[model samples]
Target: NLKLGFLVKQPEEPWFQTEWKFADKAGKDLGFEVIKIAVPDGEKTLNAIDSLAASGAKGFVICTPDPKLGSAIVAKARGYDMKVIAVDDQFVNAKGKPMDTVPLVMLAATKIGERQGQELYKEMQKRGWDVKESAVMAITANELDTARRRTTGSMDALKAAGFPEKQIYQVPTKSNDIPGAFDAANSMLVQHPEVKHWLIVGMNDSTVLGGVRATEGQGFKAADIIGIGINGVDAVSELSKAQATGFYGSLLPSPDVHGYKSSEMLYNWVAKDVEPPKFTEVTDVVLITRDNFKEELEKKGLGGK
Candidate 1:
């Protein structure tokens, strides 16, 4: 029986959970066994690769927790004659250049951020916040290449919209996770008490939510804050709240499609001798907001009766 390995940084995350479910189902449908592993660190990721290769996996799909491990991973997997595919995160060579030969499946990172920024601009215009002197824009940023690209896209969009660059702040977070973002945003809020209206965007839903919560904790009303997210799942839950939330909307990327397509590509290559493209970009993302959260969720098969 043919086997493939699937590795993700945080399997418990809503995004990766959906990816795993779809990838597992696709593997079974393609008559292959998939070995799924959650590697939260470098050691475990490398070990997982070794174990998968030893267990006769022809190829593996991985979302590495650290981009620095990309070259090492590629070398190790190649040494064992196993094909490698990257998903969600791109693998890089030792010089920090993207591995040109490896196939990758991911969302249209920069485009999604630009779209989010445009939507935020529209809402700001409607609320007259764009011209308000006390309004400020905050972006939760991190070191990840993909996250940086997304943030840059939003910043560029806002600049093009004629927003003042001086009022824009990039709050640095270590992990780009919830608590990290909260602390970063909280500190920034304390430093800028003069700013009454906060326009926030982040690489993912957690960062946006974190900024919203931090702003709220500072006694800011939900109406005074507009937080745009990237991932849909968490944003959906926030928008579903009975009370008003600062979370305005999110750019919903299909994790199910990412999972299923990556698996399918690997399967086709290993089983049918088909070569996959270097980059399979998934661009079918939509903006989700409180007004259409229910409809959007149902359409994505994430809503319940």
Candidate 2:
């Protein structure tokens, strides 16, 4: 079988794990030997691509650690006569514009954020917290375009819902991870101790969990906080807890679907002379909550640990 490479950062992450699993399966089913590589940094990513090319990889699907490396990566891959596709993140040129030649397969960023915000709003309305003196703590990472787009969509939803602008607080997390969000949220909470109730929304589950952890550590009751995350993986454990958790809901995007589709697209291109679309967005995002997480997880084949 011909070889194809699947490269991504953070393979240990539940999302990337699922992506790899499905990508590997799809590549094998499509008669390609999928070489999966998980690199931590841009330098390692470039090196891995070089190694994959040396090993006779026909093409690759990459989720780069830094989108800024897109120009270099594409130049190198195409120089070796290997086709390239981007998954989970878009490949941008040196000028930061999305590359027209390389295709992208990813979740609907803005829609996911809007759905998260809408779910939080529903929970707020159900609990009569919308009219109360509550703050919406949006955990965000301004450095990432995807995160910024998601945050913008979330903010738009809150605004359309008539949530007060003054009550919306954006807490920028430097690392865009749990600890970073924890520190940012902790500091925000410390600065605004007077805001008794909080509604947390973030680009991903880690950020939401960090905000939830921070609020709870500060002696805030679970009843006073509602956290809506973008990814369902972390929310599963939280929702499965015996006691109540501040994690209220999540937008579950299918990484497995993304993986399968991207691999299939590459296979078709390499084997059948077909061209993939410039953008193939995966839009089947589901709203997952405590009440239906089990069912949703099962539907997505993510159940039973």
Candidate 3:
């Protein structure tokens, strides 16, 4: 018996919806009242968070950083003994990393990188791409550990599959932005014009899209661009291009799943007194390619794939 609130800025996003679906399912499984607060802006988010707490929510699921106002609200909520569970990123109030302040959290979902990596690993093996024997690159935002994990998971997959690390290209994108990915991939192509059938593991759809565009421009249809977390219309369109060209495939994680599980995770902590496992990594990544695009879209009820 817990009042659990999920705090998501712009809850209308597709990923959030996916997370919500899973959360809803979890609620059915655990029997908790799930209330969601979707704040459009920082000011609204903060106000909404306060409302949820005032209404008696014991904890909340907070995703990426809010513009500014919403974050202030998070600090306020914390002051009231309400827990803010972070996903895909951590929460920090200090100007810099805390000298040493461990948080009290129930089940954290990590190994997310590995989650995405294993996805690519399965697809690559299907495609018969010997990652170690071939030249490869894992692109990232280079700021967050989650972003880093995308590459790490792919890298680990390659190593475990018998490929040495030395053969892979480690490309760091600017703030993990697509423009940075474009710049990084472009330079790689220009420098290694002969590198055919190279593997790319992008931090997200944006990064992979940039690389995909570059690959098409280079006239290299044999190159495969793959990785995780594609949730937008534009991102799906980009995936189509990758599939049409040489985009290997991605381990598409649903934000909706995070939303759904996050809520359940919070409810368990508040009432069940269940110490949710830390780093609770869900294992359901989608492998999107031309072969399965239409099918995936249909399965998601998105239609028109």
Candidate achieving the largest lDDT: 2
- Best-to-worst order by lDDT is 2, 1, 3
Between prediction 1 and prediction 3, which has the larger TM-score? Answer: 1
Q: How far is candidate 2 from the true structure (C-alpha RMSD, Å)?
A: 1.5
User: TM-score of every model?
Assistant: 0.94, 0.95, 0.66
Ten-residue segment with the worst summed lDDT in candidate 3? 98-107
In candidate 1, what residue range of length 10 has the lowest lDDT sum? Answer: 130-139
**Tens digit per residue, CA lDDT, model 1, 162-260:** 878888887787666778888888888888877878888788998888888888899989888888898787676688788888888888889989888
Q: For candidate 2, write residues 126-171 as lDDT tens digits.
A: 8876355799998888766788888889888988988998889887
Ranking by TM-score: 2, 1, 3
Clashes of each: 0, 0, 18
Better of 1 and 3 by lDDT: 1
Q: Report the lDDT tens digits of candidate 3 across residue range 25-47.
A: 77778886667667555566677
Superposed model 1: Cα runs more than 4 Å off: 134-137, 140-142
lDDT of 3 at 242: 36
Against the correct fold, how does model 2 do in TM-score?
0.95
Q: Residue 197 lDDT in model 3?
A: 57
